[PDB]
Amino acid sequence: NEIAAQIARQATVRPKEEPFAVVFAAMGITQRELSYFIQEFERTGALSRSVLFLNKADDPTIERILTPRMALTVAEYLAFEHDYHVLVILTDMTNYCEALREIGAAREEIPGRRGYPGYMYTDLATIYERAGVVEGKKGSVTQIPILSMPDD
Amino acid sequence: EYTGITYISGPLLFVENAKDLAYGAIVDIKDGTGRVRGGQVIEVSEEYAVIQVFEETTGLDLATTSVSLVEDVARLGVSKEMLGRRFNGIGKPIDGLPPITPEKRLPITGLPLNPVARRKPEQFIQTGISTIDVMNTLVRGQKLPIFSGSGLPANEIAAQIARQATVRPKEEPFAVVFAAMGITQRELSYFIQEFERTGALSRSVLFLNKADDPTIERILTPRMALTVAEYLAFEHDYHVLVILTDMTNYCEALREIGAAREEIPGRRGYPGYMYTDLATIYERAGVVEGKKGSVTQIPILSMPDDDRTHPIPDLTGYITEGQIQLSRELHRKGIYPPIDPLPSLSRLMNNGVGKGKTREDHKQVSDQLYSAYANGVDIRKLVAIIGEDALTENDRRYLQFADAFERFFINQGQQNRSIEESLQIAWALLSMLPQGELKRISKDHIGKYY
Amino acid sequence: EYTGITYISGPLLFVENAKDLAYGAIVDIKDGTGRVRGGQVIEVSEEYAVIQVFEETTGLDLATTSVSLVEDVARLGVSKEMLGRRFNGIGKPIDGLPPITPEKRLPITGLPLNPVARRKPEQFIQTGISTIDVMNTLVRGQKLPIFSGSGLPANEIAAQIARQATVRPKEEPFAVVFAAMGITQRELSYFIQEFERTGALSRSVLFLNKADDPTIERILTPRMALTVAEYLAFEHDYHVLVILTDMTNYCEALREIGAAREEIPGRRGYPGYMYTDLATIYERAGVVEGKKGSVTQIPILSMPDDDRTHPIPDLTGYITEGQIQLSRELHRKGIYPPIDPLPSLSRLMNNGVGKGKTREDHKQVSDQLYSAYANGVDIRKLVAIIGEDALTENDRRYLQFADAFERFFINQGQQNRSIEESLQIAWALLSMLPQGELKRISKDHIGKYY
Amino acid sequence: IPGIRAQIRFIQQVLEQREREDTFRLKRIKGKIEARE
Amino acid sequence: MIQGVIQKIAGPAVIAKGMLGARMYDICKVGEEGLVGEIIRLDGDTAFVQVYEDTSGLKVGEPVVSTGLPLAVELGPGMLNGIYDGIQRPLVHALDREKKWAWTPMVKPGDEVRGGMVLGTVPEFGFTHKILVPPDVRGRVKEVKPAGEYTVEEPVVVLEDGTELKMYHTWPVRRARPVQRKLDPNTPFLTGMRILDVLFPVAMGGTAAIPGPFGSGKTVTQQSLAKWSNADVVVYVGCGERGNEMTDVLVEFPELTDPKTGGPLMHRTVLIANTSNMPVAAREASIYVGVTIAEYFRDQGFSVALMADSTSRWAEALREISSRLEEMPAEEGYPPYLAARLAAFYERAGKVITLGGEEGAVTIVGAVSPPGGDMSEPVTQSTLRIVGAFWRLDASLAFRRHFPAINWNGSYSLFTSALDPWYRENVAEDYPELRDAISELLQREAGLQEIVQLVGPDALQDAERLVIEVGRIIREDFLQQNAYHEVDAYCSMKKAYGIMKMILAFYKEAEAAIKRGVSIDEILQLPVLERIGRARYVSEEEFPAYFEEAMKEIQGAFKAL
Amino acid sequence: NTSNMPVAAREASIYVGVTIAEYFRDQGFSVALMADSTSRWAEALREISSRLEEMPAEEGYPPYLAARLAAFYERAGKVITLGGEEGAVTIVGAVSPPGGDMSEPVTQSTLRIVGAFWRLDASLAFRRHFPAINWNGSYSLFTSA
Amino acid sequence: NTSNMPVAAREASIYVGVTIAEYFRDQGFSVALMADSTSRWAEALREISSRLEEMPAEEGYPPYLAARLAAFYERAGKVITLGGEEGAVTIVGAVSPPGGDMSEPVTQSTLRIVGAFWRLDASLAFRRHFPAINWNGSYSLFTSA
């Protein structure tokens, strides 16, 4: 998360005719972590070129599932309609997965390996498919997803 | 009041009552059978129907067959005269003697008496086995499992403790309750003969459940045994030692019916309720109100497939104050008793040792032997890796200490070692180590005892 | 009589009949299809509905679609004229010739004829392969599996035996039944061409099931083959050799439907019934009543993932009288045939060897070669541990013997070795060992044969 | 010493063989009980 | 509708039946087609029946009738040389109704009798059959046949003025035959195989599991035991048959000979087949039918061996019936009920004091066939927990041509102390000490071979090389036995100890010579060694002469120094 | 939380405790909440869920076994109480996997929430190294804090 | 066969291609069918199967895959088209195991069907030996053919 925050502060597209923006999305974070991320964006002036989405651990599980989709939609809008090179930072995909997995049981599915949802790869594909150069070739969407190893 | 069977699937029988439903746990009696056939109520299904579990085979039952409610669960014919008798899992005579003449008739689930005090286990139980008394002392009120595996002499140890156990100068009388579950006819004949020949039977109540006895009778066996123990301890003020072999076999029977009961299985095919049924047995131990008596348990937990992580043995660990874990590998090296010295623990050991109990150096000696044996065992691995000759002089001493610990301390030629005898052997073997390497023994003890 | 589909899930189709239910095993025909679509009745569900298994895809079926009952299962058009023809898994021509003109129409499950006698397998089948005839002799009535793995030439061996096998002076005629299951079009074209070119086809019935043929046709293939063999053996008094490749592929198809049939899976995802279906195939072998004929099996069992402990190959071992196990490791060392000399056995071998059968020294020579080869193979490990130069003179001879056994006895330059030829090579290689080291050959044989 | 790592290596892979594959006939059996029920 | 019923539905292997109001749970029922089934589920409006055969031969409306039995068996003259199946019937009756047997009265009118008492003798097949008062029958013999010839159905005696007794009797295979007491394991079941009799003894009336993967030689141990063990009668439940293992035994065993007499082994055997086309029900009941027949012969005062091919397949047949009855699947989908049942089976084993005194026994040898090397459930796991003995055929020992292929490191028996006194009193005073010493040898070898696997054999001292030398002689000259040799096929108790003392004496002399700086290479090529290697083939005591031949030869090595 | 007590009570026990804990921190006290253990609380909850016929998942645990547990640990923290003043609730939760497996319920979900883990090591204990905390497998995200 | 496409489409892609391939060979053309790859096709199929609640096996793959994959490769071959003339479809399929494991799905089942295997070797590539085909681990069952 320190690496993710540092990239958010520092990233640029060196001489590009296009403006640069960051979309930073955090999922299932503590109140302490949320306060820290906020303070960091505000103090450094990184906030001026960033949209930040923060989902807390105690926020509804459905809100966590929607978080990366809000973030990717904002990135695609800025890139396509405003011609920007947008960098999207998503932490942590494993925490997103813990929430999606949490509901698969309530949804009536037979579980797959390790207790996961049988649909793990085709939901995750809806997020990793959303990246690349946008039409016009003035903008683009880049992703830096964080994947923590459960149990390493 | 009478009911009629509406469904039969193996051990599970549904029974409909037109008047008065029998409460959960009541014993019902099937009419029209050559031998008594008990059905224990397990659930109220709705529509005046209850779901039950049979204590014997259900072959020959017909829909509509009549059933009566006995008005109570199965029960214990409680009396001091329980001592000196051998009974079945249900408390029926196996010794050709008359049925027990009850002083009181007690429910067996653990609800009767409310005997336990909110006081910690304390004071010595002399098993007569050095590897228990000296290093992993059994205390009055404790639950100290024997942890073993198939092929190992866990039952020989259980029988030996039953013969030998006492509470050395206690104002209170001492009794043993020995319960065996799912044993062969040969094993039953052996246990009987042993109790009768030694005169151990005089101070013991023995419950024997055979492999071919009803599965429900096996489930009731530990409850008959614990109820007798609580009665003797609370109403007669006795220090009672309960020996239960084998908890894994009890579990195989309870597991066997969970399927017939309609539950979704849990890990390894076990009943989802494994830990809250097992808790009803391990909760029943400790000092009793008045502090004249106590109930102590020595449950045997054999590893299925030698796997100590199987849910049965694994959930049993929390119910104990002392654990003695036996290992096949150790038994195959000819070390008996085949106790794993780095996996046997005394949760309550510190409460039964030191000055005025055993001896002041007991904790230090136990700590040093455990540390040296564990290092010595790891060095057996290092010898395999590098070769014997490449081992340092210091490591060679620890390697040798592990053999000395196994040959002289673990191994007993059947023999009742006093704690003084056990500490002496401990100090004798410790001499093999450099004195400079006794990190866990304060200098005060080295000067006084080395 | 006609029915209507009430449910469709993959290969399983439920069908309701208003009049006359079709009995289990009857073949039903779906109306309104471009290509014939058979449904085999598997169960009676109750309420005039049966549960069936489709012999081809069910895409395009609709609820209410009509179905007729053919009045019978599926069957074998039995005749001596089966010899010289190539057929599908279902016994339909593949050779552009007319359909078989039946002398009798036989059920194929094994119920027809009741052909087997309660007599032990006996007498020689000359395969023409030295590693079978000399060391692991095939006997009339035996089940002797070829044990192999993916990439190995098991099918080349199977085809070679089909070309070469005979019953040397027998008063009885000899025939081959060759059945292939789940093979490619290329493999089918190859097998056909081989039988036709060599003139092996004259004394053989060939059943070929392709990978893309219906799974049910693959299941029926070994049953068509065994029924033809039993007919030729019992009604025509022939010694028949049945070659079935590959049993593992048969199993993959049977396993494929077990899921569609609603069963809880067993180990490794297999059908729970694996061993009692497989038993219906390995039970069908032995001398037939009259003792003029016999049915012998050579089933091919490829190790899935090269694992001989997989439930399929592992359950097949009990159905055999001789096993030839092929190993990838050996094949990769360039030793062909890639037979593991310490895992190939003759269960009924002792019944087909000795004076009046092969030669009096056969058992002794076989025992000595097996012992020396096993020692030699272990010494390859010892060479790796210590180095070649550190091996004793005696061990070096055993090391060398293992190479000699592989180079000269196992390896054949395609070549029909008589048992006399095979014993001669055996004695020639044995000379490499010190005579004082021939522990398993009595002195009488050394003097006479060395 | 590369004898250690050698045949003893066969060691780790019959060991590893034995169960990420065995442990799996199993996560899936139990599914299978009320996965099937 | 009390004694009969009518099929409501059939498919999915369960027949639902209307009626059968008096049927018992687990009773065999009969369909009009001739198939049998087992009553599994008793419900308020139907009986669910497991069909022991193909269900297409069953249709809705078909008549079903009770048999009244969980099952039964006929027990009288005509059992020997007979070949039956899972439910006893020629490979249909059971005992010939026409065959005449010479009955010899062994009781006079006025005698008081009890169940198990011997009233007559029949030389049906030498063997002498012993006619007993059926269990649960006592009183006074009011009438008894004279020495003559009679068929089975004839009445040979009346008791309490009218119970009528014949030469045969029936018994529920599912119920273990009664006995006064199951004596503690005391007498060894002399196998004749050195490794077994010495290291992993089986007691008469003991339960010793045979376990290992497919093709390790499990059945073969059983067959050799029958050809040579000291049981008068054998009850072979040749279950898990397939491909042709049925016909392999059908016309084969009828030729196998009794090494002891030189007559057919079937003449003292009862076969119980369990083929794949047979319903799970029949194979399930096969061990119970066999054990009951086994208990019947021990009641006469015979020591019988019960060989169970195998229980893995019996548990698979039972799991099929249970799943069809919709009982909750557990581990590997097996029903919860199996462990208690399997144990109950093995509990019926034992040497007893039969009704009316006399001693007899049933020793059980059960085959173990795990799904594939896993050696877990069903078979192995539950079995190895009951049985007191386990002889582990080892495929690696087999590939190495070490026979019998019994792993002396992984096998175990407890009865060792139980039978030691029989050996000490009747065979040799040093039986126990000798087998303990040999086992310590084998134990030491195992440890040495593990180390050598690491550091190689070059560093080995002469003392350690000697232990491997003698350890190897124990394995090759003792443990390994040739079932195919006319002599070594059976090894009498007297021969077993004599060979043991030749080996142990060679050991002592070997260690003694080394201690005096005799080269091990000199001992390894000692002439007597080759004779010790062929000792198992000698049928005369010329074997104990080898001890003196060993001592003088070592002296010739003490001479040369 | 004894075995004779309904799954309901043991389930509610952590919530009753945390509320009492939050109550004392409101006064301006630093309180420690020690939870013996959550493995048994999740078993009591699985019993209630299965009886309610909720769909079983991994190890037969209900799907609502991760969001709840997280919600519990979220109530931990040092705060500026109503009317100023500072107080805190520190949580130490025991982890007891079914047996060494260290998967579900307890461990898995917990180790993902908690910021600190002190791994008692049975091998460190047998070796008489106390406290038996494995300095290689334990972790805290508070070192810099 | 992109990631945003349903598992269904990618599953059908090899069948659509093979049919088009068979169509051109019918004209009397020799066509090459190159399948990037079947590992991803089996992952798309496992997703569909698990969603349909079919029983997972090894690596959670459905039992049905081996027969299907084989059926695909069986449609390869040089034929005498309808109305005489010869044409052919040669298949070259890419193998991408989950990661070096080279087990299931892809590799294992495929290497059992295919007659040819060209093993690109990363060590041969690093050594700048091109083509990076391992001449020791590659094989063709057509040499004699």
Curated annotation (Swiss-Prot), chain A:
GO MF terms held by the record: ATP binding; proton-transporting ATP synthase activity, rotational mechanism
GO process annotations (BP): proton motive force-driven plasma membrane ATP synthesis
Top-level taxonomic group: Bacteria
Keywords, alphabetical: ATP synthesis, Hydrogen ion transport, Ion transport, Transport
Similarity comment text for this entry: Belongs to the ATPase alpha/beta chains family.
Job of this protein: Produces ATP from ADP in the presence of a proton gradient across the membrane. The V-type beta chain is a regulatory subunit.
Protein name: V-type ATP synthase beta chain
The gene coding this protein: atpB
Interval of the full protein contained in this chain: 161 to 319 of 478
Curated annotation (Swiss-Prot), chain D:
Name of the featured protein: V-type ATP synthase subunit D
Protein role: Produces ATP from ADP in the presence of a proton gradient across the membrane.
Similarity comment text for this entry: Belongs to the V-ATPase D subunit family.
Gene giving rise to this polypeptide: atpD
Source domain of life: Bacteria
UniProtKB/Swiss-Prot annotation, chain E:
Catalytic reaction annotation: ATP + H2O + 4 H(+)(in) = ADP + phosphate + 5 H(+)(out)
Keyword Translocase in record: yes
Pfam families: ATP-synt_ab, ATP-synt_ab_N, ATP-synt_ab_Xtn, ATP-synt_VA_C
Gene Ontology molecular functions: ATP binding; proton-transporting ATP synthase activity, rotational mechanism; proton-transporting ATPase activity, rotational mechanism
Gene Ontology CC terms, in alphabetical order: proton-transporting ATP synthase complex
Gene Ontology biological process terms in this record: proton motive force-driven plasma membrane ATP synthesis
Keyword Mitochondrion carried by entry: no
Ranges in coiled-coil conformation: none
EC number from the UniProt entry: 7.1.2.2
InterPro entries: ATP-synt_VA_C, ATP-synth_a_Xtn, ATP_synth_asu-like_sf, ATPase_a/bsu_AS, ATPase_F1/V1/A1_a/bsu_N, ATPase_F1/V1/A1_a/bsu_N_sf, ATPase_F1/V1/A1_a/bsu_nucl-bd, ATPase_F1/V1_b/a_C
Positions that bind ATP: 212-219
Keyword tags: ATP synthesis, ATP-binding, Hydrogen ion transport, Ion transport, Nucleotide-binding, Translocase, Transport
Family listed: Belongs to the ATPase alpha/beta chains family.
Role this protein plays: Produces ATP from ADP in the presence of a proton gradient across the membrane. The V-type alpha chain is a catalytic subunit.
Protein name: V-type ATP synthase alpha chain
Gene, per the UniProt record: atpA
UniProtKB/Swiss-Prot annotation, chains F, G:
Keywords for the protein's UniProt record, in alphabetical order: ATP synthesis, ATP-binding, Hydrogen ion transport, Ion transport, Nucleotide-binding, Translocase, Transport
Entry's Gene Ontology BP terms: proton motive force-driven plasma membrane ATP synthesis
Molecular function GO terms recorded: ATP binding; proton-transporting ATP synthase activity, rotational mechanism; proton-transporting ATPase activity, rotational mechanism
Gene Ontology, cellular component aspect: proton-transporting ATP synthase complex
Similarity field: Belongs to the ATPase alpha/beta chains family.
Function (record text): Produces ATP from ADP in the presence of a proton gradient across the membrane. The V-type alpha chain is a catalytic subunit.
Name under which the protein is recorded: V-type ATP synthase alpha chain
Annotated source species: Thermus thermophilus (strain ATCC 27634 / DSM 579 / HB8)
Taxonomic placement: Bacteria, Thermotogati, Deinococcota, Deinococci, Thermales
This protein's encoding gene: atpA
